[PDB]
Amino acid sequence: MIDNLTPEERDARTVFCMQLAARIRPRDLEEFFSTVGKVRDVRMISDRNSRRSKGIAYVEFVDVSSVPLAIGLTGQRVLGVPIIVQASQAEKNRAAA
RNA sequence: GGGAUUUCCCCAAAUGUGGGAAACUCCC
Structure with missing residues (x-):
């Protein structure tokens, strides 16, 4: 657990993922992550x-x-x-990959 | 004959939910 979070990294706890299937379960990404x-x-x-x-x-x-x-x-x-x-936020900075 | 899995297309063309269509494998 982070010792000193901020409302700026709080949003980074949520990542955006794409190219997923049209019906894949939310459960199938949790066992993957x-x-x-x-x-x-x-x-x-x-x-x-x-x-x-x-x-x-x-x-x-x-x-x-x-x-x-x-x-x-x-x-x-x-x-x-x-x-x-x-x-989600660094999506545009990570698009350089 | 029925049920389960993924895929593709249109408006705009990569984000917190429009609609339609296609294929393979598996189970009953």
Whole structure:
């Protein structure tokens, strides 16, 4: 657990993930992120606005110490499809990868 | 004949939920 969080890193506890399947469970990302720490919850979505077509979700970790590892393994596969991880806010700074 | 898994397309074209369509494997 972080000893000195701020309302700026508080939002980083939530990462945005994309290229997810159209029906993958929120549960299937938690057992996957179990390799980068421990996760609090997941939020699947069905809005497209892009070629991923309902293929996105959000993931919230119980601690920030899981955040930098969750973004580092990015590009792994789950339930038959590749998945990406970006912090919701640093999504644009992480797009340089 | 029924049930389970993923995929693709349109408005805009990568975010907290529009709609439609396609394929494989598995179970009864």
